[PDB]
């Protein structure tokens with residue numbers, strides 16, 4: 072199989088096109104229901120005064136999250152993935168054709184909920200974000216090191232629920248730091264909004280550092 | 283067609299299990315839904331009546347295998363690597379490492395994944411999908427494929443439903459609409475509310491083979 076080699080070529084092409092039009096793109100990965108959509112929703116709300124934001128929403132049935140993002144004023148391209156367990160640069164490249172990249176500053180891509188397959192499939196983004204939550208259990212990070220090593224930012228979300236599931240958030244934070252020393256690691260609650268400042272900081276730092 | 287090869291091996295697996303009087307269950311779900319904790323509780327309640335074995339499938343299978351072992355089950359760990367689902371082939375090899383004449387119940391924990399496990403019959407008698415409220419109340423209608431393969435749909439962590447804004451009535455209705463033939467149970471493994479209904483499904487399923 073030559074799958075991963077052909078994907079990378081398309082990812083580099085995606086990145087070059089985005090750079091050509093001054094677009095900074097983020098890949099939002101995570102487990103099922105970790106909080107990817109709600110994070111994106113909050114990011115749109117709090118950055119739209121400064122940036123023109125577009126989204127690509129990928130899932131079995133993309134409409135649910137597409138509709139959520141749209142009500143926040145962002146242009147969304149939905150991608151129904153169906154039986155596929157991941158997105159790829161090929162599909163993302165075609166979604167880009169539906170966007171006016173000259174009228175876009177930021178691109179948020181919500182990947183399929185999956186802590187395994189998306190690790191191998193570069194989409195052509197500048198940064199990769201992995202979102203997990205306390206409610207998945209505090210062994211979630213050490214159980215899935217592969218995807219963690221591909222992240223630029225690891226978000227441990229739903230910290231407000233940690234005690235209710237018996238999750239040690241300090242342990243999780245340390246797991247993340249240890250498995251990927253180069254990543255930023257943020258403890259977040261999208262309910263209380265604690266930690267959100269650090270996610271915004273990551274977005275802004277990323278924009279300034281491009282190329 | 284790798285799915286044709288899988289079906290062939292699934293029928294082979296099921297044939298072997300029937301031969302030795304073993305009833306097998308495929309526990310599917312999202313990541314952290316509560317598959318292992320449900321199996322742990324099932325072992326505790328059933329181990330006096332039945333000889334129980336387990337297959338624990340995950341990237342690093344030791345975590346769940348050890349959790350199951352302390353409850354008094356024979357467990358075969360299955361490291362799934364970069365593969366995102368168990369298949370009949372891998373399960374067939376695990377069955378070769380089990381003494382099936384000394385086993386009544388087989389519990390298989392599939393990889394945490396609501397997509398591709400729907401396509402890969404393992405050779406079990408019943409399929410169970412565990413989701414949880416903390417994944418959001420759109421989770422069931424977002425994954426109809428896997429839902430239609432389930433004999434039992436478990437909506438777990440009802441104790442945390444209000445905290446995440448999940449409507450458990452919606453989730454229960456979504457499940458029944460998508461799979462009218464499935465049993466649907468509202469569960470908290472913390473409080474144990476609904477556990478009796480899951481246990482009833484297991485015991486009935488065993489007697490019905």
Ligand SMILES: Nc1nc2c(ncn2[C@@H]2O[C@H](COP(=O)(O)OP(=O)(O)OP(O)(O)=S)[C@@H](O)[C@H]2O)c(=O)[nH]1
Nearest residue numbers: 103104105106107108109184229260261262418445
């Ligand atoms: N209490 C609490 N609930 C949260 C938090 N973050 C997200 N949620 C809740 O979790 C559920 C899932 O959030 P959602 O944004 O849909 O996850 P997702 O990762 O996008 O889910 P997916 O289906 O696409 S895979 C929702 O009910 C949402 O309100 C949090 O920090 N604290």
Ligand SMILES: Nc1nc2c(ncn2[C@@H]2O[C@H](COP(=O)(O)OP(=O)(O)OP(O)(O)=S)[C@@H](O)[C@H]2O)c(=O)[nH]1
Nearest residue numbers: 208235313314315316317318319394439470471472
């Ligand atoms: N509050 C509450 N917590 C629960 C409930 N069910 C499971 N949990 C918690 O959720 C976390 C994950 O449970 P676990 O049994 O490990 O899920 P899993 O499906 O086996 O997770 P995986 O990594 O193999 S994919 C654990 O910390 C467990 O205590 C519940 O009903 N209520």
Ligand SMILES: [Mg+2]
Nearest residue numbers: 107108136181
């Ligand atoms: Mg989402």
Ligand SMILES: [Mg+2]
Nearest residue numbers: 317318346391
């Ligand atoms: Mg488990």
Ligand SMILES: [Zn+2]
Nearest residue numbers: 161162164165
């Ligand atoms: Zn094409």
Ligand SMILES: [Zn+2]
Nearest residue numbers: 156188365366
């Ligand atoms: Zn996969």
Ligand SMILES: [Zn+2]
Nearest residue numbers: 156366367398
């Ligand atoms: Zn798979």
Ligand SMILES: [Zn+2]
Nearest residue numbers: 371372374375
């Ligand atoms: Zn083999």
